[model samples]
Target: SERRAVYIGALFPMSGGWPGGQACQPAVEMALEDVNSRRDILPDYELKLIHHDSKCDPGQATKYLYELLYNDPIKIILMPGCSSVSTLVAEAARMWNLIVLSYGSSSPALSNRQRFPTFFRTHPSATLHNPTRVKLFEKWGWKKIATIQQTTEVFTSTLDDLEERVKEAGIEITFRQSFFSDPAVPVKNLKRQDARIIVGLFYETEARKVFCEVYKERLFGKKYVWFLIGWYADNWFKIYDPSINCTVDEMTEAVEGHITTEIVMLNPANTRSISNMTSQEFVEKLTKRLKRHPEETGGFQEAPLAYDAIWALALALNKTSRLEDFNYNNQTITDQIYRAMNSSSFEGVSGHVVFDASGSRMAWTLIEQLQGGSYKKIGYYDSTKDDLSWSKTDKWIGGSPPADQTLVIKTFRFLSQKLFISVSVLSSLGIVLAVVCLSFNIYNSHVRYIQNSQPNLNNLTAVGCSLALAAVFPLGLDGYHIGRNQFPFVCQARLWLLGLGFSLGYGSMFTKIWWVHTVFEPWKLYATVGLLVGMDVLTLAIWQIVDPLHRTIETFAKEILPQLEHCSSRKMNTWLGIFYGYKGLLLLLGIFLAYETDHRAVGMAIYNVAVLCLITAPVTMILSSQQDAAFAFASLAIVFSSYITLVVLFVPKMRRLITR
Candidate 1:
């Protein structure tokens, strides 16, 4: 008989209209993918990802938990994504004596060890980030803030604690109001005051509805810097209110020109310094994985957290042979997973998977403030001195990221960027090399025909090459713009360039997989890839610098064509120069502004760089002329610059001008 693969059950909103599948399932897939495909990294027994849709409702969660418990192969249950769902699952897991590891839920009540013995959450509870809000405000010199608590939900219930903490910090809650989730309720109770901030402590969905209401009433605007806890998790504001300026826990997405710096919640270099050896090892492993991923572009956020949580369970289960194998029959193997997670130094996605006695993940709050939808990891803290405590602050909760931690955000960026640059260059070089070889082989075959002035063979070859160069169509829009003015113009050259880059990258990966593919690690491929891409970007930046110096001379000759330049040059005339020069200037400006603005760069650099593989796939078909390509480039560049400039300058100025 063969040993069975370990089965761990998962309960989350995998189906229906919920975004949990999009927001959360990838991590589960990644975890299973990593374990099944690569056995050496995770030894002993293959793991299975058994998932059921809970529809983000507590009733559905209860139904699924029952199903998972009866499914004899499943020993542990991964918690649901939504807080409401997690609450019910925690109760079921505790009652049934099943181990529950909640990936998304952070309800303080759900993780209470006194009530629920088998529940654990990878995420820090709202209690963690909420208390810090007051301390963060004090750090920023805000003496008073007004809040509108959602009166009917779990969110508002937590605010009472936050409110108490604020009072202890000696900050006044100048204006307080209670609002129902329903839009029918009038906004008449709101007391207007010169508050430094206005916070909506509600579920993201309801919070969005109330925010629109508040906006319609012209109650909250730039005059009051809005602070949001839940809404910023996704692109909620960017998709709805792109120009709204507010601060949230994690800076997600790149809304260029919003905020300048980028910050991400990463496992510290030493998660062990705060906990035990298992935790330190877990932190080390996760840090290695994170470093392996693209930090600059935020490519790995959704997957790493959930993957690490699953692995943490696996680490604990390594000690068990049977699904229900726990020292206590009172607690199943699943329950032991939670207990192991709470007390053991189990490595996780975000950090070490050690929990306090209460079963909350023993991780400090990593703070990243957003500017234009991008985030800058400004600092990290634990429940210590309530001020803006960095690594130097003493751990109020016993051990913490000591206040002496150095600023590694930039270090992380540079290392990530360098890797990406390298990948970009190697990929670019590979494309150019392939093109050169193909051209040479074609030229060599046609040499005799050309020398003899042959018509049939030479003419046919010329036509074939002409058709091959025109493959830019059907590759979708060559560029994307996120502003008021949306135009549709295609760039054959950009498509071709993008395609060539992909050919090089995929080809290299395939080559590596040929010999030692099975032995190859998941991250090793990406690490080199990071370097290649980083080199490519730096190469392009340098190429742009050098190309422009020579481009001026070419433009001059092209302008005085006829005897010196070609007919194509004559046709472009001054329009060509104007278009190229303007577009080039704007491109440079956008890049500079993106670099100058930290958060913007995180979004732009990370997103655009990664997509370059797909974005540049016009190598096989599109055959556009050089001038046509230049025109397309100019148009795309101008569009990007206009949107960036508007967000960077117009929105902020307009808000201040209007509010005053």
Candidate 2:
């Protein structure tokens, strides 16, 4: 007496016999025959598949699953291929206590065993691809990106995972656009955002349409990077449909130099091994029986996965029999199959078949590019290692060439020749003027008027101004160049020289103003000179401590500019404020004291203060915006501002001393 046949259900989204179901149907039938024929498992009990078309709709899938549960005497249900259908069917399976095995659904949501205890998926979750995609973006130094996905559970969940991971990595998502609701929206919105990288999370048909539109809008090129995530899965590259409305040539043009990531599958070379030949041999025989070309069925994408889904059920059934099996209903069979699957491992056609604690399969991810009408493997993302590795020699496509140059190089390139010559002449004249003042001060040291006019203090001021003028030459010569390799000593010295030179020059003038107000007391003269020197020392010390300057490379957007070295200070504005404020306070005090004493240098003090304020306002604004102009502005400020002081104070004093 033969036993009653055990019925196993299979569901997929196929309407009018779409190839998605046609490709997987034969593989399922082949697995049933292979198991029934094997003497070791279910030889007396024949296995048959009760396949249903869920039409890729969750509502429709719910109706189909209910029919399978109520009308048929089936113990297990093998899935509705997509994430939405799997969710719908799994909900019913959980309610009716029927074991659900999925060959195609790849949603991370299904990994929850508490909600989907009887559900097992041979395919990995789409969330697994997020880390790899982020790593690829990181490798290319693409920080800003825009995401476009189809309105489906799989794509939404995948995008959510990607968004979270990218945020964690400090990458920014400029915008997120979805299809189905607004099919024409993303293409228009993409043009507005500056994000050079676009992440496409859609299936083949939708992806084709999106790319076609993107190409029409001229968004595909070296300037733009399009990263596709499992849009064609493992083998949809081989399958072409007329419904896409775009030719393969058009797709090549649209996706040229773009990157794509898909779930890695067992290579054809691995199938040739005799010991692991069952799944491969079954697919070949099944392909012949269907009388379809291998490309039409996508070689073995969903087929091998379908074969493994059956094997998983078979392995669990054999274990269930060993545990206890005598006319088990849906409830008894569901518990037995769930436990059996969790405890067992098998060599599946897809690869080694083992489920994680969450019941999702582990799979490798491949990063590839579409070049010369074919996909080229650039790298692989390994799950166990959680690492993304690439070929050292293989150059990645997309992104424009590097455009980085030092500020000195850029200044020479764009700076007007006439203005450059004019500034150079002025800087040279300032140096000459400073030298003349130093010589006059030393030569007229014995003159009666010079002897009476605090000659020592005036000589010190002349020397300070000479140092200021000398600083302009070096400050004008590539002093703004910044990078790790830049000379730290030069950077520090520039700041110290600029601060001390100005302070000494202005400090001497301030002391003379005080000396004129307080009679010819030597004690008063010494105290005023000490106070001036002390003020300069205190200001220099505080400026150094508060916001010291350093040299470092400025890293710009990867797509825009290459990194280049430059000098910068953390609190540049604060440092300048402190420096200029101290100078301004001294100038105010000197002007007030000179006015009280009716001193001749009071006008010199006022005029120099006005020049300092005038030069500082524009220089600060220019340097704040265009940091490259820093050295130019600093040189101009030192030369022009100090030259006025020499003319207004020292030159007049020299003329008076010589006449006396």
The per-candidate count of clashes, in order, stands at: 58, 4
Q: Residue-wise lDDT of candidate 2 within 122-208, one digit each (tens)?
A: 666545566656666656655566677776666777767766676775666656777763355566766665435566677666666
TM-scores for all predictions: 0.44, 0.63
Error of 1 at 218 (Å): 4.6
Best by lDDT: 2
| Best candidate (score: TM-score) | 2
How large an RMSD does model 1 have? Answer: 34.8
Candidates in order have lDDT scores of 0.42, 0.55
What lDDT does model 1 reach? 0.42
